[PDB]
Amino acid sequence: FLGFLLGVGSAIASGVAVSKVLHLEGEVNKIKSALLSTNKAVVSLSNGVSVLTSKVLDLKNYIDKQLLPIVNKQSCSIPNIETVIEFQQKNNRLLEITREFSVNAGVTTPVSTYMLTNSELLSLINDMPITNDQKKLMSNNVQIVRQQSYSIMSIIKEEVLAYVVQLPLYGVIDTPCWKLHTSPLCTTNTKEGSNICLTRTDRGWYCDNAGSVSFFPQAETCKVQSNRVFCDTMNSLTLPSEVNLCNVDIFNPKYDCKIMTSKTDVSSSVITSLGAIVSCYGKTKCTASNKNRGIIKTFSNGCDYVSNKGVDTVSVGNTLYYVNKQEGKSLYVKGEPIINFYDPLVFPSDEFDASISQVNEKINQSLAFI
Amino acid sequence: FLGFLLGVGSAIASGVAVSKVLHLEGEVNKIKSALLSTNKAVVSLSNGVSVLTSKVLDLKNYIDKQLLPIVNKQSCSIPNIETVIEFQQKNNRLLEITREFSVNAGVTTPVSTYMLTNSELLSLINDMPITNDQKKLMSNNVQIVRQQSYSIMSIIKEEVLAYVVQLPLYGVIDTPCWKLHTSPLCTTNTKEGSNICLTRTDRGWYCDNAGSVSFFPQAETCKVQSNRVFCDTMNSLTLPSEVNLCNVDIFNPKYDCKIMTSKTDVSSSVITSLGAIVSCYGKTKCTASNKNRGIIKTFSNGCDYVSNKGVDTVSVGNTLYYVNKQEGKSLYVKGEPIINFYDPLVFPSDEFDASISQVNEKINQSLAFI
Amino acid sequence: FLGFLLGVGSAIASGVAVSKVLHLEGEVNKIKSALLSTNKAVVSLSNGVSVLTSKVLDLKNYIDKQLLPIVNKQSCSIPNIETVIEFQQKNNRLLEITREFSVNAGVTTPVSTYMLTNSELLSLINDMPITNDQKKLMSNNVQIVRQQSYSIMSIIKEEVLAYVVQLPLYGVIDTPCWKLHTSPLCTTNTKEGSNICLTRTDRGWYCDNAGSVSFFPQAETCKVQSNRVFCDTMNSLTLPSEVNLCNVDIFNPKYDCKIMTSKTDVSSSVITSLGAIVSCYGKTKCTASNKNRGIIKTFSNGCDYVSNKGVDTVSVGNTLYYVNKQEGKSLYVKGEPIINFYDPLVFPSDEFDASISQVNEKINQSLAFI
Amino acid sequence: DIQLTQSPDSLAVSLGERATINCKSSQSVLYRPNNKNFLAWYQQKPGQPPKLLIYWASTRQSGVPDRFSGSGSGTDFTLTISSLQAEDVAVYYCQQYHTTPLTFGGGTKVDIK
Amino acid sequence: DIQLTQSPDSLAVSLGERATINCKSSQSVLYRPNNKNFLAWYQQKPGQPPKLLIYWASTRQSGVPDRFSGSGSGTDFTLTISSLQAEDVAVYYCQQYHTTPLTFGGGTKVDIK
Amino acid sequence: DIQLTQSPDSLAVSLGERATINCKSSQSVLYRPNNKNFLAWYQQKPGQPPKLLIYWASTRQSGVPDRFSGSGSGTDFTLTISSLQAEDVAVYYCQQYHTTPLTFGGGTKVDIK
Amino acid sequence: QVQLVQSGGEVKKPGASVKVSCKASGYTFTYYGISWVRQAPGQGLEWMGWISAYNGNTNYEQKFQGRVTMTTDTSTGTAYMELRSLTSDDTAVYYCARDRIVVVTAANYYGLDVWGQGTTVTVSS
Amino acid sequence: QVQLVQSGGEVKKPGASVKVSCKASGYTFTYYGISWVRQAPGQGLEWMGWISAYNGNTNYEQKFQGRVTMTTDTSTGTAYMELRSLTSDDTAVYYCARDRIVVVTAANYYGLDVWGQGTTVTVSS
Amino acid sequence: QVQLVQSGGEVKKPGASVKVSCKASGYTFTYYGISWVRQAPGQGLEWMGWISAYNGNTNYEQKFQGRVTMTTDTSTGTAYMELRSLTSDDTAVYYCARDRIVVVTAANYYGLDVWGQGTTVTVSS
Amino acid sequence: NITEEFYQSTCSAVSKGYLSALRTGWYTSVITIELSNIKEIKCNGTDAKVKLIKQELDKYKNAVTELQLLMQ
Amino acid sequence: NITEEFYQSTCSAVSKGYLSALRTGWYTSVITIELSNIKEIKCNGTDAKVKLIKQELDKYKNAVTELQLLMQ
Amino acid sequence: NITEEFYQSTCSAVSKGYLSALRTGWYTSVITIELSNIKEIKCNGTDAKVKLIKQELDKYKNAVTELQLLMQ
């Protein structure tokens, strides 16, 4: 819900910048001279930035030394069919690259195997000026590096086709990270329109970083492989560590926990990592079922939670959810719902970007009169 | 507008689960033994779940029996060029599969023809344990089944590359469904800042299901082919049937219809199935035009509707919309706009998650004073 | 933020319409007769609409005249391997087309090079009934035309496979256009919960059009190539020219500028075209750094701006942004922030769809009492 | 209750001349939440039901001729006819709907000299 | 302060018969922001702390037998036992929490004839 | 109107000593919507316009030396100089802006003994 | 077209009861109330009562309390006025008028903007 | 299970001071206040004071002002009530009761819904 | 730099009229009002009037009603002070002062925080 | 060319100097492919080239059938 | 078949006449490919066809290795 | 490893035990392909292999031209 709080960046802003340097006179000639005898080199551009340059394909050599010499000029007839096949192979990759660029207007993400093969990407990772821990982390999870990379078309001139590959840099690794799932808490009264609710809006990923917490509201952007979470710091907010206190005490005096308020009580399920939260309201029938014993639990009105140890599916109304069967340990902390604390008569509804202190101020401003 | 009310699920949660079972010792050997002499079989895994297993490609046979025997070991020279071509064909599909997985980090959607060809998908549909009506429905609209399916990379070991295909199951078919389009209803006074508006926020798809209504707020997710609507129940809410009453009486006492309120009056068009709703407010000029006779209607300030019988395009300001030319019958129900009922002085604006009863309570709470 | 104000259209509504005409009896025969001796023609359908028709591939000729005659019927053996290769080439494109359609359920966007090659697209652009300026504009930026086009599968019958290509029409070109970036302005008081803030919600693209302004709130949809901005008028609002006054005087009496209010003050950066806006609040440390001299500026609490002349990166908290290095001239207009004008005690917070006049009315309605 | 009194009981005005009717209430008819004077002026002809001419303080019902106008506030209200015509010969009533019961006026008859 | 008085000081009721205790306050205990009468009825047994029976105007604490009921408003409140039983022999107190100090009632003892 | 009176009319304070000026208004200058006392203290030197020293109840304008301070509320307000210096020899006025007209004080002149 | 149509005139004897119907057309019947106004020959309008067509709430004149009954039929969209113990003072013309909007609180209410054609009731021997 | 447990009874001499403990279980201790009620033998309940467990705010009875001190230990979730200058009138049973919710403004006030078992203090020679 | 610059001093005869200019710099002129204050030799400040630079609203002193006219020129951002029927009492120093913001309701006032350098007007023969 | 102006009062930047290309309408065209109705050749043999041709023809027929299913 | 009703009071349209296909559950299946464990042939020669076969086999091995990295 | 804690008071779950990989920066590299400037061979003949080579060379030239249009 807090994705509107994020700032606006430019992902390719760096890469395009290098692309621009590539249009300056002499730069293509410099890169060409550097790769004259080698397929990998380090080149310092006019602005002084040092970049790794690689020659992945050499069509010039094949075309000018293995195709033209073997064809006659009087009644041309190629001696061998295999040559044709070889040409079709060698050109194929180039064609594919062009196709992708034409589809993506010169900026393609994720980077495909035509732009940068697995071996070339691994070699680039090995040659990057980073620590060995980062090299090991990204040498693995190569698919995530591909999904977080960009490919920018830069220039085609002086018989050289150059494009720019923009790879991620993970400066923060192995720090503790956790995920917060929130569902709605409504007072399960009988009358349809007499119910007031609250939901916490701070759902998403949190990660320790340099003494603060990086908060990613769109948990869909973050990619989870095993217990590793790859997240883009661009779509994040820097918060004090005290935000974690909101998990153990929503009314703690150190941090003001963000919440929303409403009068609509609909039943829904949030499938968490090790279980499922079920908010059952109204006449909706909510159950938890196992593939062997069938229905094993029936939820009453309110908010409940079931782990995935014995539960395989959860049915809320006409919806059926499959729970994640990832191994782990779940704990249930019993407590009085905080929704019951509020007086429905003076409860402020239809508040989206609010918090517990802001809701208290709103209630106290309704008791300004009277 | 109500897409924030939906719960959070995990689409591949089931499929990955089966993938996990595939890592247990003996399971790959079981599937291999089951497909020893057949390309299609039914296998019961350790947890007892029964799954259809298919062998789509057999590279082992070709590589070990049709390539190695025909090549010499002393000065190897293949007798025939055609063999090479055959190899290129047979390997091609595998390469494509790998490429897709590398692009999608092991989870690809929609399922392409490389992962599962049309014939293989039809055979799987025929062998699925479902009713004949579902088999006929999904045997048709194969492209929708592809668009609603997942392909999860699972394991590659013991000379067996196994992945998981997760196909949809349509348990609710042929029940009545309808779509609700809403546009903004604003007062049409002369002064710029004196006008008050209201839109109904319950736009989207509604479908009868087990005595209730499944409501899909993001109508873009639902896929319409002819008069058939394919919708995912994950992105839905279970509502009582009385919600339909809101179409015939917005002030009915059975159901509380959801609306929003604003003081912003902008002109816009909503292109419906059999026509177009036009909200012309301001000095904006709104017209409806036919490809033969040119402009055939000019809209006055307010909300109006034009069918597609003679109207081909509708122009609102600088925007031009093409209407859907699907054959059907349109009806116009004349009535006094409800916006005119509300007093602008006490009208509560800037309410998003509200309803008729909530707006009435807000007005009555402004008449708490005075 | 204003993307909810937009109307709902149907992008392929026109194209599908033509597709429908293609199912009527005689239309396929008409198109076939028109392209009997030519690969390009103009055909008038039953409804009288004139459409360009092209024959991109002719598999019938090759299959029936170059494959069947050269194969024997008694102990068939093809004399030459090359024929097979030729067939593989000629069929390949067709297969690719089918694959794309199967992936996209008959409607594919953007249009790939298999559906319409570069030469065919350029020929269609040349043959379109538009002005020479539009032909030059779209003949260039072919990738944008591809990204803004649709390909609709229509019919396959009478040995003719026909689909519909729906190309953009740019009726408004070379008019002035500009972009508005907004960040949040909050009071930088010491106490955590004593800070009121306000942001402008009218961010996005504005373009002069027929005496009014087309406003595109989702600036991500618009595609910028050099100083040219390609925007879809469907996702736009028509506004008076006086909206530009909001840039020079937020309290001007001609137009009511849209803003939103909040009590949450978080630090972020908005990367603009020629610089970066930095909102630094709380204990967050914000800096601007150059690749050569390192950190060159440290931001204090409040909203500031740095151009890209010497600044290469900007760090806000744990986030690092790269600025766009596009050449241009930046100007800084010093002025007292308007957030300092408002009294925090009577400041209306949690307003999203508001404006200057609406906020003034809300404050004046809090001074109805007292 | 709020009793309404009209003046004069009978009115005689020549053609094309102004016609003034005064309506006074024992209590204020102002509706405080919206700051509106809940008073209405109707006209009645023989064999016909009353027709709404003026509602609120001074607002003309759609389709009412522009010659009819309302004015006044607080305790005294006035109905004015800019130019009396032949078709305007009718009995005019003032009513209040600020609070029940809805008390109509005594009624003023307009005749042509 | 708000002093509370109970009547009668001692009560003797036979088994299965209605019992009534009246509590009167020197000042109104109505909580205006939520329109609730902040009065509570407790029962106490020898060697045991008081237990909450009634809170607000007339609301029963969860687990309290349905025979106990509350009524009244403004200045007079009433605790009613539909059918006195053996286990209901206890001292009953009324106390107000509308404003500090929390003044408990004098206390009424219920005995079986 | 709200008339303002200052005391004393003339003040003589030695260097580095406190300087007290009292300003009294015939009516309260508290601004109820924001709970602020709309009173301001200015200083004026020969050949120079008045400069704003204190605004609201007790708030110092940016750039004003920390020795100047304001206090009081309701009807009496006080301007205090912690340590009078040579540059502080000026005429001090207490003005109000709660309601028009803006009535300035009589004016107090500060001199060094 | 927004209109109200009333039943024909009736002749009754003293001590009897009279039922007057008023059908609404051209607008949503349940969104507004209905007021009943009586006019004696050569006399001004007299208000009798008001019935809400949304929930059936009724508000009668003090003089007519316990003597007049108003009912609403939402199926046919018809209001019914019923009067008992008729006397020689009850012969008059009865009108049904559309009243304030009851589905919106503090709605705009321009008075009795729509009136019925009128039903004449004569009480004589 | 929501409950309060108090320390055992004490015997004190006149002029001494007594400390009574009350530990809370089954609920969040810092979300509610704690009231202390004294009951003399053969007499009604007497309210002594109320301490907020959220921020330590205290409100004492006028008769006990300056004589009684209440403290809150959030680590152990225990309320302590101390009394000085004991006399022959102090001998009584002291109860700790859960009081209004202090983390939410104008929260639902159901009174003293949870009570402690009681600590007897006897002041004699 | 936020500042106000006034025109030079003037010498006038009784019965004439005087125009005083005040140009604003360093801030948005139309967001605030302008007050005019008169100071006689050896006398305290006297308030004359206030003109809003946003919409031209004027509020004059009761003593100066009908005698003084204030105008605002938003193009040059200059406020004015015109006085008629000058007498031997008019001779004084006139200051222009920035007043509270005229674009936000119930905005922060801060009093007259910015003052002009002052224009001396002498009325003598 | 491209210029930018930052306003501190409203904390907003405006970038000017761009030229418009607004998509106002749609142009529809029909692209056709001439297909063949011939089925697989009835001939049988041990030649590898004819088998490759048969495989390619099977791919072509499968593509046509898939297109027909899409249309229907 | 398909009908539409526009309501002017609420400025809303309802289109009816559609038939449901609601995805209520998932069906999981396993698709397997029989791979070969053989490495590149040790033979060396100047023939172009064997070099093409070696290149194709290298592509196949690289695909297998990439799949193995994906799984791990 | 991975643990989860559900809180009934706030109806919220927290899953802990994960390890971070935050993308903090970008690394830019240049990938180059050596192209040929040679046009189509002027030779003409009836051979099918040279025609296939000409078709492949036309595809290569078209790809180069498309890339040039992209860059421009």
Three-state SS letters, chain C: CCHHHCCECCCCHHHHHHHHHCCCCCHHHHHHHHCCCCCEEEEECCCCCEEEEEEEEEHHHHHHHHHCCCCCCCCCCCCCHHHHHHHHHHHHHHHHHHHHHHHHCCEECCCCCCCCCHHHHHHHHHHCCCCHHHHHHHHCCHHHHHHCCEEEEEEEECCEEEEEEEEEEEEEEEEEEEEEEECEEECCCCCCCCCCEEEECCCEEEEEECCEEEEECCCCCCEEECCEEEEEHHHCEEECHHHHHHHHCCCCCCCCCEEEEECCCCCEEEECCCEEEEEECCCCCEEEEECCCEEEEEECCEEEEEECCCCCEEEECCEEEECCCCCCEEEEECCCCHHHCCCCCCCCCCEEEEEHHHHHHHHHHHCCCC
Tokens of L16: 């802990």
* Residues E71/E78, Cβ–Cβ less than 8 Å: yes
- I39 to chain C nearest CA, in Å? 30
- I83 to chain F nearest CA, in Å? 18
List the domain range (segments joined by +) for residue F36.
Answer: 4-112
Tell me chain I's radius of gyration from C-alpha atoms: 14
Looking at chain A, which residue has its C-alpha nearest residue L9? A337
Tokens of B102: 């590398």
- Asked if B367's CB is within 8 angstroms of G106's CB, the reply is yes
From chain C, which residues contact L within 8 Å (Cβ)?
A: 80, 82-83, 85-86, 89, 117-119, 140, 142-143, 318, 320, 322
Answer whether C touches B (≥3 Cβ pairs < 8 Å): yes
C-alpha B10: how far from chain center: 16
Cα G88 from Cα G72, distance rounded (Å): 28
Amino acid making up residue C244: N
Answer whether residue A291 is part of any domain: no
CB contacts of H114 in chain A (<8 Å) are none
- Asked if C60's CB is within 8 angstroms of J36's CB, the reply is yes
Intra-chain end-to-end CA distance of chain F, in Å = 37
Q: Which experiment gave this structure?
A: cryo-EM
Cα G122 from Cα G8, distance rounded (Å): 12
- Asked if B80's CB is within 8 angstroms of J65's CB, the reply is no
Same domain, residue pair C118 and C84: yes
Which H/E stretch holds residue B18? helix B13-21
C-alpha A339: how far from chain center: 33
Antiparallel, parallel or unpaired: β H68-73 and H78-83: antiparallel
Looking at chain K, which residue has its C-alpha nearest residue B114? K31
* Residues F28/F75, Cβ–Cβ less than 8 Å: yes
Phi, psi (degrees; rounded to nearest 5) at A330 = -115, 145
- Asked if L30's CB is within 8 angstroms of A31's CB, the reply is yes
List the domain range (segments joined by +) for residue J70.
Answer: 38-72
Cα A219 from Cα A215, distance rounded (Å): 10
Cis ω on the peptide bond leading into residue D8 (within 30° of 0)?
yes
How would you list the strands of the sheet with F91-96, edge to edge?
F10-12, F108-111, F91-96, F39-44, F51-55, F59-60
Looking at chain L, which residue has its C-alpha nearest residue A125? L27
- Asked if B258's CB is within 8 angstroms of A321's CB, the reply is no
Cα F44 from Cα D59, distance rounded (Å): 58
Tokens of C256: 């009511």
C-alpha F39: how far from chain center: 8
Looking at chain F, which residue has its C-alpha nearest residue C346? F34
Tokens of H53: 């467990």
CA distances to A298, A305, B32, B147, K24 from A293, in Å = 13, 19, 30, 32, 20
Tokens of A219: 């948990």
Residues 6+ apart with CB under 8 A from C361: none
Our CA dihedral for C66, C69, C70, C72, rounded to 10 degrees, sits at 150
Report DSSP letters for D62-89, one per residue: TT--TTEEEEEETTEEEEEESS--GGG-
Report DSSP letters for A163-201, one per residue: EEEEEEEEEEEEEEEEEEEE-EEE---SSTT---EEEES
Answer whether residue C123 is part of any domain: yes
Tokens of D96: 């209040």
C159-162 — which CB contacts under 8 Å span 24+ positions?
A: C159/C60, C159/J34, C159/J35, C159/J36, C159/J37, C160/C28, C160/C31, C160/C32, C160/J32, C160/J33, C160/J34, C160/J35, C161/J32, C161/J33, C161/J35, C161/J64, C161/J67, C162/C22, C162/C28, C162/C31, C162/J30, C162/J31, C162/J32, C162/J33
DSSP code, position L24: E
Same domain, residue pair C156 and C258: no
Helix (H, G, I), strand (E, B) or coil at B129: coil
Cα A200 from Cα A187, distance rounded (Å): 15
DSSP code, position D95: E
Answer whether E touches A (≥3 Cβ pairs < 8 Å): yes
CB contacts of C346 in chain I (<8 Å) are 106
Which H/E stretch holds residue A29? helix A27-34
Residue to mutate among C252, C256, C336, C357, with most I CBs inside 10 A, is C336
Comparing C-alpha atoms, which of B141, B291, C33 is closest to residue J28?
B291
CATH assignment of the domain containing F70: 2.60.40.10
Place of tokens 């309320």: H79
Compute the residue count for chain J: 72
List the domain range (segments joined by +) for residue C47.
Answer: 9-166
Helix (H, G, I), strand (E, B) or coil at A123: helix
Tokens of K55: 């290149």
Same domain, residue pair B278 and B329: yes
Give burial (CB, 10 Å; 0-12/13-18/19+) of B240.
middle
Comparing C-alpha atoms, which of A139, A125, A140, A137 is closest to residue A52?
A125
Subunits with 3+ Cβ pairs within 8 Å of H are A, E
Give burial (CB, 10 Å; 0-12/13-18/19+) of F106.
middle
**What is the CB neighbour count within 10 angstroms for residue L47?**
17
What residues form DSSP beta bridges with C199? C184, C260
Which H/E stretch holds residue B333? strand B329-333
Same domain, residue pair C155 and C200: no
Same domain, residue pair C159 and C192: no
- Asked if L49's CB is within 8 angstroms of C82's CB, the reply is yes
List strand residue ranges (DSSP E) for chain G, in order.
3-6, 10-12, 18-25, 32-39, 45-52, 58-60, 68-73, 78-83, 92-101, 119-123
* Residues G36/G58, Cβ–Cβ less than 8 Å: no
Answer whether residue K25 is part of any domain: no
In Å, what resolution does this model reach? 2.8
CB contacts of G27 in chain B (<8 Å) are 335-336
Tokens of A324: 């994640």
* Residues A240/A40, Cβ–Cβ less than 8 Å: no
Looking at chain A, which residue has its C-alpha nearest residue K65? A118
Place of tokens 């196949």: K60
Place of tokens 């059999």: B274
Counted domains in chain K: 1
Residue to mutate among A62, A84, A89, with most K CBs inside 10 A, is A89
Q: Dihedral sign for Cα B306, B307, B309, B311, please.
A: positive
C-alpha H18: how far from chain center: 12
DSSP code, position G9: P
Answer whether A touches B (≥3 Cβ pairs < 8 Å): yes
The breaks in chain J (C to N more than 2.5 Å) occur after none
List the domain range (segments joined by +) for residue H54.
Answer: 3-123
CB contacts of B343 in chain D (<8 Å) are 34
Helix (H, G, I), strand (E, B) or coil at B71: coil
CA distances to A122, B111, B151, C323, G85 from B97, in Å = 21, 11, 10, 38, 92
Amino acid making up residue C218: Q
- Asked if B271's CB is within 8 angstroms of C20's CB, the reply is no
- Asked if J41's CB is within 8 angstroms of C170's CB, the reply is no
Which H/E stretch holds residue A360? helix A356-366
What residues form DSSP beta bridges with E51? E43
- Asked if K29's CB is within 8 angstroms of B160's CB, the reply is no
* Residues A57/L33, Cβ–Cβ less than 8 Å: yes
Q: Which residues of A256-285 are buried (b: 16+ CB within 10 A; e: fewer)?
A: bbbbbbbbbbbbbbbbbbbbbbbbbbbebb
Q: Dihedral sign for Cα A232, A238, A241, A245, please.
A: negative
Answer whether residue A40 is part of any domain: yes
Residues 6+ apart with CB under 8 A from B354: A350, B258, B259, B260, B261, B348, B362
Tokens of A202: 């701070």
Same domain, residue pair C70 and C138: yes
Antiparallel, parallel or unpaired: β B329-333 and I92-101: unpaired
Tokens of E66: 């349905």
CA angle C139, C145, C150 (to 5 degrees): 140
CB contacts of B4 in chain A (<8 Å) are 1
Amino acid making up residue B275: G
Answer whether residue K23 is part of any domain: no
Answer whether residue K22 is part of any domain: no
Same domain, residue pair B274 and B341: yes
CATH assignment of the domain containing I38: 2.60.40.10
Cα G74 from Cα G53, distance rounded (Å): 7
Which H/E stretch holds residue B197? strand B197-200
B108-111 — which CB contacts under 8 Å span 24+ positions?
A: B108/B150, B108/B151, B109/B147, B109/B149, B109/B150, B109/B151, B110/B146, B110/B147, B110/B148, B110/B149, B110/C103, B111/B146, B111/B149, B111/B150, B111/B151, B111/B165
Counted domains in chain A: 1
Counted domains in chain F: 1
Residues 6+ apart with CB under 8 A from A24: A45, A46
Residue to mutate among A50, A166, A353, with most C CBs inside 10 A, is A353
* Residues K15/B178, Cβ–Cβ less than 8 Å: yes
When CB atoms are compared, the residue of B271, B325, B349 closest to C8 is B271
* Residues A17/A37, Cβ–Cβ less than 8 Å: no
- Asked if D52's CB is within 8 angstroms of G106's CB, the reply is no
Which H/E stretch holds residue K53? helix K48-71
Cα A96 from Cα A116, distance rounded (Å): 12
Residues 6+ apart with CB under 8 A from C191: none
Cα K57 from Cα K41, distance rounded (Å): 9
Tokens of G37: 């106004």
C-alpha A236: how far from chain center: 11
Place of tokens 């030469």: C119
When CB atoms are compared, the residue of G30, G54, G104 closest to B342 is G104
* Residues E24/E39, Cβ–Cβ less than 8 Å: no
When CB atoms are compared, the residue of J11, J56, J66 closest to C91 is J56
Counted domains in chain G: 1
Answer whether residue K3 is part of any domain: no
**Phi/psi-derived region of residue C363, left when phi > 0, alpha when psi is between -120 and 50, beta in every other case:** alpha
